[PDB]
Structure formats: structure tokens, C-alpha cells
Structure 1
Amino acid sequence: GRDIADTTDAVRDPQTLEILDITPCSFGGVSVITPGTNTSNQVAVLYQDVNCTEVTGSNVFQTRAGCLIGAEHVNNSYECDIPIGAGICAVASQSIIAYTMSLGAENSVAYSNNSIAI
């Protein structure tokens, strides 16, 4: 068989007459997150659109955008500083951290049917 472009999607193996599927191997860009040469010399790298099963080699963290290496996941949310993607942002506490961005402080106004503020 062949794809919509002039490439083969499958083949028949000689000497056995067997059908073998074909899938292209992984590829993607590389990004470097830096707080600045005026602050530190540490970086974290992200291998876009690939999962941490394959290959600076410190930690592993799987997000919806790729495999992030060199940053530590944390739970408490803060205002976004460096956008990474899909709701994940990323120096604080002598390390590079990755968290989920926060939309703002939660506030509730006291609604009543005979009250007003002037």
C-alpha cells in the first residue's frame, strides 16, 4: 500500500508473504528554560511531543506537551511566570519548579435581597 503522499504505508515480506505495518519514528523540537544569566546558570530542557520512555538527564516529568527534565513538580499553585503549555508553568527555592497556573484569588460578594453598599 501507499499513503496519500508518495510513501509506502505497508509492504509484503518476501520468503514469507507476510504483512508488516510501518510507522515513522519519533521526532520533535527541543526547548531550554532559563531564569537568566543574572540569576543562575541552571536550565531545564523539554523534548516536545515525545514521552519520557526514550531520551540533561536529572529527573523525568510527563506533561501534555512533552518530557520535562530538570524541574521538580510541586502541588501549590502560583501566578504563571514562564509558560510551558497546556496549563503548566515554571526559579524559586533554589530550584526550577513546575506547577499549574492559578487564575486568581477567590472572592465572594455577600448577596442579599435588602442590602446595598455605597
Structure 2
Amino acid sequence: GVLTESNKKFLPFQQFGRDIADTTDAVRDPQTLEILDITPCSFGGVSVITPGTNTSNQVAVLYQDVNCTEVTGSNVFQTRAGCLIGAEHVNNSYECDIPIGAGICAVASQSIIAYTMSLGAENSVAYSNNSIAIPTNFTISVTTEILPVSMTKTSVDCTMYICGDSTECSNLLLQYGSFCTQLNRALTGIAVEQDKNTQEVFAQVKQIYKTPPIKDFGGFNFSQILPDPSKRSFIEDLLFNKVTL
């Protein structure tokens, strides 16, 4: 630690003071009878800022909640998050791709920049106590929205896992009571919950409606969405080839 001079004055019979959770915070030196605080010197996490490997290779480094009075090294800047090395501060602001902290963010013009984030396109609405706007055109638009409903119904058994077909390991395990009963019961419970999740989200209808073969829906195409007996329809296949199970 780093040693500083203490305002706290020991009583004539105490040697060293501990602050909380048993860490020696102050100590009296033996050769001078002075009192010194012992504080930990700077330390903390380190993170990297990268625009991705595929884009480029130059990256920045952020030392977390530390001054840059303590230590590649092109430009330094002190932000409320800590020390930013390798990025040049810019004044103008955009919508930022890399969160940092306290609003700062971070590649553009073959370099890594740091800059306070811009909230949005700052425009004003005009107001007057007798004017009203009214739309004349309209666009119907389709948005996707993705939700999860289930995980893999997994199961693990202690007796085969911690022992692995070892008899004496099992004979020693049985002393620990019924931790295996609890674990098997918990996993089976979440498996039951997982099947119930799907059974609830999808089985909302108690018929099976099949559209008539005629597709004249007011001139609305549905051929890209409705099921095709060629394959489960086209769209679900498209998503079905987008996971890495």
C-alpha cells in the first residue's frame, strides 16, 4: 500500500488500527511513533474497445476508474469511466456503437474516436394555438418481433455425475442425504414448466382451420407466409436456418 500521514491519533497503548472486515488501515511506526494510513494504491479492471476483428485491428484500452497519472499510448483522455488510451476525443456527436460509461462511446474515418453520445435528431415541433397538422398519406408497414418460449429440457443425475459408476464413491455420497433428490426434482420441474410454456403460448385455438385453396384475399399476397405442402412454410424455414444448436 501507499503510506500517508494520519490525522487520527492513537492512544498510548494501541499499535495498529483495523477498519472493517479485518484490514489494517492505520499503523504506528516503531522507530518514530508517528501514525500512517495505509491505503491501497490504484488498481482496477481493464477493458478493450474494438470495432470488431473483421473491420480492422487497431483497438483502444480503457482502464476502469483510474487516473492516467499512472500508466499503445497514442492519445490519452480521462473520462468518468477511467482512462481511455488509443482514441482521440471528438466534439461532434452521433449515435454511438460502443457503450463506455457516463455517456461516452466509441471506428470512423480509419480511426477510433471517443465522443459524448447524441440523443437523437434534435428537431422541434412548431406550435400555435390555432394550427393543426393532419396526415394525408399513410404507409402500412410490417415489423418482426422475436420472443423466446423454451429452453432445452435438460437433466443431470448426481449418482452418475459426481461418481461415474464408482460404488464406494456412491457409498460415501449417500451420507450427504438427499441433495440428488432435490436436484433431480428441480430439473424435472423446469422441464415440465418448459413443455407447459409452449403448450400455453401456441395452443390458443381448439380447431385446426385450413384455408380454402382459393387465394384471392382482396388482392393481398399471402403466398410467402401461409404454409406450402412442398416443405412448414417458407418463412419459418428461413429462420430455421439461422441457429447453431
Q: TM-score range by the shorter chain?
A: over 0.9
* Deviation by residue 1:7-62 (Cα, 9 ceiling, x = unmatched): 11111111211111110111111111111221111110111011100012222110
CA distance in 1, matches of 2:27, 2:125: 67
Q: Does residue 51 of the first structure (1) align with residue 70 of the second (2)?
A: no
Return 5+ residue gaps in structure 1 as ranges.
none
CA distance in 2, matches of 1:3, 1:88: 35
Larger C-alpha radius of gyration, 1 or 2? Answer: 2
Q: Please report the TM-score for the alignment, with normalisation by the length of structure 1.
A: 0.94
Q: With CA pairs under 8 Å and 6+ residues apart, which has the higher RCO, 1 or 2? A: 1
CA distance in 2, matches of 1:110, 1:44: 43
1:22 counterpart SS class? strand
Q: Please report the TM-score for the alignment, with normalisation by the length of structure 2.
A: 0.46
Residues 110/59 of structure 1: CA separation in 2 closer, same or farther (3 Å cut): closer
CA-atom RMSD in angstroms: 4.7
CA distance in 1, matches of 2:34, 2:86: 44
Say how many residue pairs are matched. 118
CA distance in 2, matches of 1:98, 1:47: 15
* Deviation by residue 1:61-89 (Cα, 9 ceiling, x = unmatched): 10000101000000000011110110101
* Deviation by residue 1:86-106 (Cα, 9 ceiling, x = unmatched): 010101011000001001112
2:124 counterpart SS class? coil
CA distance in 2, matches of 1:15, 1:115: 85
CA distance in 1, matches of 2:31, 2:118: 61
Return 5+ residue gaps in structure 2 as ranges.
1-16, 134-244
CA distance in 2, matches of 1:110, 1:66: 41
CA distance in 2, matches of 1:49, 1:112: 49
